[PDB]
Amino acid sequence: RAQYEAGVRPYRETYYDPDYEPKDTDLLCAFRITPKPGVPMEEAAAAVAAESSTGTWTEVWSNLLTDLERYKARCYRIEGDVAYIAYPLDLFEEGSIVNIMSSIVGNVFGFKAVQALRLEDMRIPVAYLKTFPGPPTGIQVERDRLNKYGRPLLGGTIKPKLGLSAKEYARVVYECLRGGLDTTKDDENLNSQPFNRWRDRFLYVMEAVRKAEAETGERKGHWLNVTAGSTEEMLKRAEFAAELGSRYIMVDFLTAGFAAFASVRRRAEELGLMLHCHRAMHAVFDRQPNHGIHFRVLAKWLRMVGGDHVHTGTVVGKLEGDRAETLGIADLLREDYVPADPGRGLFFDQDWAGLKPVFPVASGGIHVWHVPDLVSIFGDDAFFLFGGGTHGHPRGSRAGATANRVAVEAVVQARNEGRDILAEGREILEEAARWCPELREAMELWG
């Protein structure tokens, strides 16, 4: 019987601490806020920090049953328009991306107090990051499994997306693999449809993958899409791909949810399967620069929970992508310590605590002419996917795969000689096509 001072209080009163110092175990979040006309920047920042933490729109009586200052988040900086908020380590569950994405972004994005809100970045502390497994294989282990070093690995998406039967699907797969491509993949729409059921597609394509390995002598793979409507189904498709001798599975992690993704990742590690992750339904988040979650945040969350591959997006393709921010994500996935760089959009230094790296996959509307620019951005450790740029060749899919492989071999080999890439990519390609008929027909058609 104390009768706490009741009523509604401004969030600025008890959730804005400009004198606070972030500990090396706190989670730091950087929000881009667009507050109401009239609502101050300080109040909107405090409102975001309260409702992602112990806060509530009124003073509750149970606030006196806890040491609030232990647990409450607080906005310790407002850089004009970006508000930095620090969350204590105790607020989150160990080794679960779901809880952090239920607190930071679970509820605060739809308040009447903020017209718009974007989670620009965060800093996962090493204390929290040590509870996560990370990618199952990584970059270095994967290169040993495929036995392909010193160049960007080449792949492709089988097209058209839907319609092909398993007999004709494996026919296209074999043509691309035989023509030079190190990998192919099921398109994200292709889970299991009446025209192409999953148990028939898995058998047919892996017969082609086994066949293609015989003539070429190299090791090929196909990213079989195991995404389904339930976790048990996604797993059931994982063992079938595992017992067929497949090296690879593919999951739409954003659509399937991080919980089912983490369930699949555990199995993919137990079956010795590399796990390509497709970022389908990401632009619903990371397209508008005023509302949503930037993709670098979802690239962080991926490497924590663990995925061998991810799409970061080509800068010059048909899909959106920024030259500076794409480079930041590539470093944020492959490196081991990422210093904060305002030019690349990185707000906090991110130490990855020994978590193994991730292949950035560059896919989109790219063709042979985009190879010099892609090599400049991604370098060696990356996947290049030509789905419409391979089967769109005037003389078939095997010829299209050869031209794509020749373009990358010539550009990388020219970069390894000290020759500039950006300035004379057109040249490099021209005196690479002077000896390859397919490359001439590739650049003749496009451009």
CA distance 90 to 72: 10
Choose the binding region for its own copies from 239-247, 279-287, 374-382, 428-436 (rule: CB under 8 A): 279-287
Coil, strand, or helix at residue 192?
coil
Q: Which does 363 bind (CB under 5 to 8 A by kind): Mg ion, its own copies, ligand CAP, none?
A: ligand CAP
**What is the closest distance, in whole angstroms, from the C-beta atom of residue 181 to ligand CAP in the complex?**
12
| Shorter beta-carbon distance to its own copies: residue 63 or 413 | 63
Q: How many residues does the chain have?
A: 447
Question: Quick check: 416 binds its own copies (CB under 8 A)?
Answer: no
**What is the closest distance, in whole angstroms, from the C-beta atom of residue 186 to ligand CAP in the complex?**
9
| Shorter beta-carbon distance to its own copies: residue 158 or 414 | 158
Q: Rg of the chain over CA atoms, in angstroms? A: 24
**Pairing mode, strands 248-252 and 221-225:** parallel
Residue 418 DSSP label:
T
| Shorter beta-carbon distance to ligand CAP: residue 136 or 400 | 400
Q: Is 33 in contact with 88 (CB distance < 8 Å)?
A: no
DSSP E strands in 229-316: the ranges are 248-252, 274-278, 292-293, 309-311
End-to-end CA distance of the chain: 78
Residue 384 DSSP label:
E
Q: Is 92 in contact with 128 (CB distance < 8 Å)?
A: yes
In the shown chain, the binding pattern of residues 162 to 191 toward its own copies, with x for contact by CB under 8 A and - for none, equals xxxxxxx--xx---------------xx-x
Question: Quick check: 288 binds its own copies (CB under 8 A)?
Answer: yes
Question: Quick check: 93 binds its own copies (CB under 8 A)?
Answer: yes
What backbone phi and psi angles, to 5 degrees, belong to 424?
-120, 35
| Shorter beta-carbon distance to its own copies: residue 271 or 445 | 445
Question: Quick check: 126 binds its own copies (CB under 8 A)?
Answer: yes
Q: Is 14 in contact with 58 (CB distance < 8 Å)?
A: no
The DSSP secondary structure of 333-349, one letter per residue, reads HH-SEE---TTTT--S-
**What is the closest distance, in whole angstroms, from the C-beta atom of residue 400 to its own copies in the complex?**
8
- Residue in 15, 31, 76, 109 binding its own copies, rule: CB under 8 A: 109
Which sequence positions are flagged as catalytic? 159, 278
Residues that bind ligand CAP (CB under 6 A): 56-57, 107, 110, 157, 159, 187-188, 279, 311, 313, 319, 363-365, 385-388
Q: Which does 394 bind (CB under 5 to 8 A by kind): its own copies, Mg ion, ligand CAP, none?
A: its own copies
| Shorter beta-carbon distance to ligand CAP: residue 125 or 345 | 345
Choose the binding region for its own copies from 75-83, 112-120, 178-186, 430-438 (rule: CB under 8 A): 112-120
Token digits of residue 441: 């027909």
Q: Which amino acid is at 238?
A: A
Burial class (CB in 10 A: 0-12, 13-18, 19+), 29: buried
| Shorter beta-carbon distance to ligand CAP: residue 22 or 364 | 364
Within 8 A by CB and 6+ apart from 445, the residues are 392, 393, 394
**What is the closest distance, in whole angstroms, from the C-beta atom of residue 51 to ligand CAP in the complex?**
6
The DSSP secondary structure of 123-174, one letter per residue, reads E--HHHHTTS---SSHHHHHHHHHT--SS-EEE-B-SSSS---HHHHHHHHH
**What is the closest distance, in whole angstroms, from the C-beta atom of residue 281 to ligand CAP in the complex?**
9
Token digits of residue 358: 């991730």
CA distance 72 to 6: 19
> CB count, 10 Å around CB of 229?
11
Question: Quick check: 142 binds Mg ion (CB under 5 A)?
Answer: no
Applying the rule CB under 5 A, the residues between 176 and 205 that interact with Mg ion are 187-188
Applying the rule CB under 8 A, the residues between 58 and 87 that interact with its own copies are 58-63, 65-68, 70-72
**What is the closest distance, in whole angstroms, from the C-beta atom of residue 311 to its own copies in the complex?**
10
Q: Which helix (H) or strand (E) holds 426?
A: helix 425-433
- Residue in 46, 124, 262, 299 binding its own copies, rule: CB under 8 A: 262
**What is the closest distance, in whole angstroms, from the C-beta atom of residue 329 to ligand CAP in the complex?**
11
Q: Tell me the number of residues near its own copies by CB under 8 A.
A: 130
| Shorter beta-carbon distance to Mg ion: residue 374 or 429 | 374
Residues lying near Mg ion in the complex (CB under 5 A) are found at 187-188
